[model samples]
Target: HHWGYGKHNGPEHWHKDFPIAKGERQSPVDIDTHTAKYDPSLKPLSVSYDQATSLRILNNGAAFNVEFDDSQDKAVLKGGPLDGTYRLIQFHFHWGSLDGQGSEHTVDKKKYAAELHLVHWNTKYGDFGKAVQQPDGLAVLGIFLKVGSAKPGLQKVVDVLDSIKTKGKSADFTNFDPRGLLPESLDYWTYPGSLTHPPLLECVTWIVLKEPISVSSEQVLKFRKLNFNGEGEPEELMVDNWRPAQPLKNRQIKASFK
Candidate 1:
């Protein structure tokens, strides 16, 4: 009684209680950018974010997290399809209630209006709960939130979403600067996925970012004013929370730009 996106606990009833949600490296896939594979041995990606390890900002009833402090490392993610330093900690967004479709990976298939997971981990699994059960631990970083102008780092995260409008609210979001929410071309699209939700862990490595970073349409309608029911429940409205394209079985999607 706890999976959501509604429609009877959406994402198609989450494989009846996450049977690896039909396993084998799942995730929001379908970037068919003309069948990717342009890899010239990756590398060329690197971020240093230390905006004071901006911590706290929530609404976790599903999407709108921000958290980060990652013990130490202050913030790191080096090289394209990383092999070592992965730290970040938390970042989230998945939307759709209009503005063209809530993103969850789709290129040749288009879909975007939100989709920004940043989550990292894998300082060689020193522990992120043993790095999400290792397979290269995690490395998310899938930006893609197009709408148009008005992005002062997402309006300072949409001005704290009216103090976290519900569902286990949280606040104290500091000195921000998630690299000003990227997208000045670091050209990406690597693969091997999973963790688009549920305990659907396949250990991720998803990179995904071929440029996209803008937010307006009244800044995504203030992320639909949050609220996935809390402050006395029965509210709902966390937009389309996302999770659609999956099954890119026997994966292999590399492309750091051709």
Candidate 2:
């Protein structure tokens, strides 16, 4: 309906439009790698492809919404590997128009080429609707996509970009395991935070992987080609679909080492 979250304006004025915006934990802060301390307790449990379910891909012009059937993963989390079980709700990404640079979370004030967010929730509390109320309800896994050599892992998804060429279009993704797209190293930076977008809820536990996945120049170009048309004319294609950096709010960030 609107470009952002306001009275027919951009997301810049979201806080005024939505009262919840004041309490949400926003993203895209500068992650100081030098000052980060490592912790070994935050490891990701390896999961088999058969265990993942409800795979759906929604092409929102800017990015694809890769959603999973979390019932299986929830059962796995409840059984072991974690202190609590988290449900898989939906996963999305934030990117720039081209490549070379456009993500919000920066390292030492340096921006990454792109970023992906896999959002999950702590089902121990309840379903997504109820869990969203608590501060520890959400868990987001972040991965940085850098510009360089073509990433074999991403090829599987990139090949389908052409299938959903228009806005508000989506397709069923089959025989695909999202784990295959994850980086080789599970080492990551953990923190207590909130969503980068407006209504920026601060109830998230973030896990940002240390290793970055690479994408070729051409792949980045494909993402930049997306557009949200206005009226009849095509406005400037959305090259950089990212929010500016936010304040750290004095929260401590922890790193996980294998």
Candidate 3:
């Protein structure tokens, strides 16, 4: 069972079953941001979250994850262009069934109504799928989800989206401090991508965050009540799960903020 996205497993058909999904540093590209390149020695993002390292909320419908408690490092992710520590085990979302439209990675092309991956991994490749085949392991931050106000703590995660609303549900999301969902300008735009989904791994490094953290539109239609058929099937709808912009030949897009 390969199982991935939409339209017969979307994202242009996952390169017909993952051969790196045509990897060349693939991953929601298209972020030219006026040709990013201002790197004043990137670093200045310390996010040491630990609201008891929150530990719950999953949907397993392929998204909506929130699990954490990386065993230790109590949710780390030191500095920007990172060089070491990077724990925080899970944090997910890539939405859009409407409201402006889904976001996967776009800036010069602009689009946002969702996008909030926070998965970290390094710590000298001690774990996390062998730090996704280390090359400095993983380090993602990317956050952008603008819509309007009414987003202060996400109503304890939209009140559990109606109790995981289906498909092998899960809840108990505790403490929660994914850095207050960040956005006091952590100014970013680093690069090197992959894993826009699937085993598409190129050992990420992307930081992406030029400030944008708001959500309301009815709290995003409860994440489109995603369930894509399960446990007795029949009632699909994964909010088109998002995965577009890709291909930037020989990547290059840095910036800590000009």
Candidate 4:
């Protein structure tokens, strides 16, 4: 693997090959609510997702992703730091082997059991590959996951983990509404940042929800079933697939609400 959460291939070592890893706009930063400025000009987030657009789920070594069919604007994200419509491409997660230290982004130094990322790309850029390269081409919605009651939405995704137990494994996963995973409050913190993982492109406009959704401890442990290694390779569990919070640098986080 080119990069991973291992001692040698993890976050710190990433800058060696991807110089942008140390750049100013790196993501998954600590959201200091005390420091975030409230921007009334920022509109409420607007999301419209079609369950039929859901395609399949795959284990890509780093994280498991539930991809969507972005053939047309079948599912879209707009408003709140976005000027044009952005199409939903896929959504994924980052978690710890245990429950306490999983989430990539934190609130006031507080970490959650896990984190969910819904990745979207600007339609003007045509597609994910090309959009990932432009400054305003992508927007990622981040939601912290707290360990509590079993979330039905999450269980559906968990039920298929055994199907994608090894790297490069995938299965048909459709008719799931990603919106069900969202917390009731649409209030969020907005900022300019890069993708948390490699290539570490500084192109994402981050919208992190202030409220967290619930995932049972048992469900959270299910994530550990995935393997970073491909079949026939050494059995290595996929856990703690999260990059630590990066430097805030010259960026200012704006809150949609006071």
Candidate 5:
């Protein structure tokens, strides 16, 4: 059963329908900065975005269409148990109550303005459905978004947010490359984890980047203007579309570089 984000199918009750969810590792939680020790081995792998690849948009009745691109910018973990080619499937965002704070991964109990997740799966493990079961079957690259004057290179995405403001609507975004949204530095924190949602399958190797991308306050507000309610119904605006903090479960979050 494929569940999604929203009041009815929110993460909390997701496991109820998908029993396998209990074993998953959900995200959007506070990442204790104090607990995170410095590491230097962590380095950013250069990625090239192939524009020839088309991006598929999924309208899950959310404010924006979840865009999935199967291209080279997406990387496959070379030495992992589930080592196989994993394509860059899609990219999405999570926001909080205010522009200043609203992401899952926190630093010293501080939340960023927003967070973006680049979801990928091991082709060797199976399709997206089958990969979540095996450890190291999935790899997620997390990047933080902060509100500022500097453009986070996400203008491409923001440029399209207005086109798909309503739920259950989708549109193709041509000439859009995922790499443009990443920070200049590739340094990141790595850890063994699971999907932040139900089917909390402990199969993900999380690579959270150290630096963040910047977007204007106006760009962030545009996301807040999304409509969560269905058409013809009283429009329920999607304000603060973020999940609360989750338990880290005594897991040790590892960084690639010290």
Candidate 6:
């Protein structure tokens, strides 16, 4: 792939190919809390997920994704600054090769162990491919991860990693609720931003949770074993695959909590 998290193709060089990486609303910005506005008027996030929407998992050369079927709207997310329901598409994680430093977005200049991205597209635009081109056509919910207790139900995903150990590999992952991956507190920080990868589409409204989910160090180590190369190709470790935080410019970060 042309875009990857590495010494040669990492976040620093994204702007060379994708101009959106240097745009006003680039993602994974340093979330400075002292300046964020606490707006009580913001609606509580409404997340309705159907476990059956969890269809399969994929290793897309760069990272692993837990994909969902959004055609029927069986699982969808709405409210919290969103105008219409955004159907569930997929979820993936960004992490580092080393311990305790993988998350994309930061708060008060602090980074987490990793971060989760739940992608959705506005139904008003027809489909995800079409939705990503408009200013308000997509929404991405980012969840930060901390090292601690084993996260409940996360093992269900971890258990399937062995099957998709290399690039372009995928496996069936049914009857899994995406909600099982979230923290109890849904309070979050909202901002306008772009996708973290190339073509870095600038059509996202990012909602990052205030609290982080728990994951054991052992579980994180498991991520290191995943391969960027396919079975026949030379193996490349899928570690430190996280993008660095970008500039905020004039964006206003609105918070749902004090």
Per-candidate TM-scores read: 0.34, 0.84, 0.33, 0.98, 0.81, 0.97
Candidate 5 lDDT score relative to the true structure = 0.66
| Candidate 4 residue pairs that clash | none
Q: Is candidate 4 or candidate 6 better by TM-score?
A: 4
Clashing pairs in 3: 6-10
Name the runs in model 2 displaced over 4 angstroms. 1-8, 19-24, 40-50, 74-82, 230-236
For candidate 4, lDDT tens digit of each residue in 41-114?
Answer: 99999998753378999999999999999989888999999989999999999999888999999999999999
Tens-place lDDT digits, model 3, residues 1-258: 456666676777777777888878888887887788898888787887854477789788867788887877887877878887889888888887887778899898988989989889997878898999975689889898988986877768877877787677888887777777888878788888877888778998888888889988888888887685566778887785778898788879988888
List, in order, the clash count of every candidate structure: 0, 11, 1, 0, 20, 2
Span of 10 residues, lowest total lDDT, candidate 5: 73-82
For model 2, give the 10-residue run with minimal summed lDDT. 74-83
Better of 1 and 5 by TM-score: 5
Per-residue lDDT of 186 in model 5: 74
Model 5 sits at a Cα RMSD from the real structure of 3.5
RMSD of 1: 17.1
Candidate 4 lDDT (Cα, 0 to 1): 0.93
lDDT of each: 0.87, 0.68, 0.82, 0.93, 0.66, 0.88
The positional error of residue 17 in candidate 4, measured at the CA in angstroms, is: 0.9
lDDT of 2 by residue, 1-258 (tens): 544512365556666765555453566577888777766555564434456664667766545677787765532222112347666666666777556468768878877888888777786875776677788888777888888899776776777766655567677876566676678887777777777765567777777778888888887777665554433455546556677777777777777653
Compared with the true structure, the alpha-carbon lDDT of candidate 6 equals 0.88
Model 4 regions lying over 4 Å from their true place: none
Ranking by TM-score: 4, 6, 2, 5, 1, 3
Per-residue accuracy of model 5 over 27-97 as CA lDDT, tens digit each: 64566655775665444454545442446554355335445554343443333222445656677787765
Q: Taking the tens digit of each residue's C-alpha lDDT, what string does model 1 give over 59-155?
A: 8788878888888888888888788798988888899999899999989899998889988888877868899998889988888988888788778
**lDDT over C-alpha atoms for residue 244 of model 6:** 80
Task: Give the winner by lDDT.
Answer: 4
Candidate number of the best TM-score: 4
TM match of model 3 to true structure: 0.33
